[PDB]
Specification:
Family: Belongs to the agmatine deiminase family.
Helix content: 25-40%
Protein name: Agmatine deiminase
Function: Mediates the hydrolysis of agmatine into N-carbamoylputrescine in the arginine decarboxylase (ADC) pathway of putrescine biosynthesis, a basic polyamine.
Structural class: alpha/beta
Pathway: Amine and polyamine biosynthesis; putrescine biosynthesis via agmatine pathway; N-carbamoylputrescine from agmatine: step 1/1
Distance between the termini: 32 Å
Bound molecules: chloride ion, magnesium ion, sodium ion
GO molecular function: agmatine deiminase activity; protein-arginine deiminase activity
CATH class: Alpha Beta
Largest sheet: 4 strands, mixed
CATH architecture: 5-stranded Propeller
Strand order of the largest sheet: 3-2-1-16
CATH superfamily: L-arginine/glycine Amidinotransferase, Chain A
CATH topology: L-arginine/glycine Amidinotransferase, Chain A
Number of strands: 16
Strand content: 15-25%
Number of domains: 1
Length: about 375
């Protein structure tokens, strides 16, 4: 697939910050038995709970496969729209479109996609349906579409809506993504497509986040211009510690696109979590996806929350201090939003991501 003849930036578009006004949220529906234990049922109920929480703030559409449409329609309240859509898995932060707006005044970017690392390093062996998800979503809404040839997922990029793009090297410079492109070329395309002017490159993402090779959205995100929330631990024996300290070092020497120094709020990860034998035993091995093994360190961070209209939808991992700390810190950081916790978010992390990874915001169209 080739590139649109003109970029978003050439038409005045840019990607707004996640905390700007939404028209709705898009979410996919999990099903594949070699990624979601017990026929996906525990995860489906958590997805449904996330969708329902977001629906209290703004409209939601859930997309479910032909096989699943009736199941999703039963499991979701009636004010959530459910539409039929083929997909190889349910991570719409990554396979869905990255919306852009201008002051038609909304468009969507359809990045190329390879299941987070392709034939030799990706999470499953067929992403043919996933390749059409963005086209189908934008067609459903009648929103124009820019197409890129470069591989990218929405979970790998974060913006402040003021010209800054926060990314990780571990992901976007990985040879499993766009090995034909340099760092500078990748920057130029993101300027052209996101409407950004400058970058903050963290070297690495969250420890344990092998699915995505260190997506930024599981490591660090903006809370508002000039302020980030960073996954943190004080425990020097956790391999997360050296990643967090290194990110802190970079951020505390970083300037945003408008010349601000970055202030960092630490958001402590839960006490380390590991997949149980009982969890792993509910997952099939059909030779189509990466294995899910007992003992794996879960890539769990409260940074993988989602911002909706007046709501923050945050994971809860069962940790008897870090869950409530995360709710408090987020409540203080977003004092005009209601902070909602989602219990059993572990069910999503077992499969490689969390709340932010299963959502994709559709901005309100400026008038
Ligand atoms: Cl209800
Ligand atoms: Cl400011
Ligand atoms: Cl694993
Ligand atoms: Mg795409
Ligand atoms: Na892991
Ligand atoms: Na990967
Ligand atoms: Na063990």
């Amino acid at each position: 697939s080739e590139e649109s003849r003109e970029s978003p930036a050439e038409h005045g578009y840019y990607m707004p910050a996640e905390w700007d006004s939404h028209a709705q949220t898009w979410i996919g529906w999990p099903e594949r038995q070699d990624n979601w234990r017990h026929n996906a049922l525990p995860a489906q109920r958590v997805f449904a709970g996330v969708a329902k929480a977001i629906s209290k703030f703004e409209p939601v559409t859930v997309c479910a496969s032909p096989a699943q449409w009736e199941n999703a329609r039963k499991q979701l309240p009636e004010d959530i729209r459910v539409v039929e859509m083929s997909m190889n898995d349910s991570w719409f932060r990554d396979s869905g479109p990255t919306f852009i707006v201008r002051k038609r005044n909304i468009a969507g970017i359809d990045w190329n996609f390879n299941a987070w690392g392709g034939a030799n390093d990706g999470c499953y062996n067929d992403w043919s349906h996933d390749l059409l998800v963005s086209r189908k979503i934008l067609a459903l809404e009648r929103i124009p579409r820019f197409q890129h040839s470069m591989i990218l997922e929405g979970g790998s990029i974060h913006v402040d809506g003021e010209g800054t793009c926060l990314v990780t090297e571990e992901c976007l410079l990985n040879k499993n993504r766009n090995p034909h492109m340099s760092k500078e070329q990748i920057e130029e395309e993101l300027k052209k497509y996101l409407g950004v002017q400058s970058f903050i490159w963290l070297p690495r993402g969250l420890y344990g986040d092998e699915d995505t090779n260190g997506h930024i959205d599981n490591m660090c995100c903006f809370a508002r211009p000039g302020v980030v929330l960073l996954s943190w631990t004080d425990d020097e024996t956790d391999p997360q510690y050296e990643r967090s300290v290194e990110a802190l070092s970079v951020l505390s020497n970083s300037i945003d696109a408008r010349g601000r120094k970055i202030q960092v709020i630490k958001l402590y990860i839960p006490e380390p979590l590991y997949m149980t034998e009982e969890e792993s035993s509910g997952i099939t091995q059909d030779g189509e996806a990466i294995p899910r093994l007992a003992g794996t360190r879960l890539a769990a961070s409260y940074v993988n929350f989602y911002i909706a209209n007046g709501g923050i939808i945050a994971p809860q991992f069962g940790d008897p201090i870090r869950d409530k700390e995360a709710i408090r810190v987020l409540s203080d950081t977003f004092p005009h939003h209601s902070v909602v916790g989602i219990e059993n978010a572990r069910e999503i992390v077992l499969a490689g991501g969390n709340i932010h990874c299963i959502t994709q915001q559709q901005p309100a169209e400026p008038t």
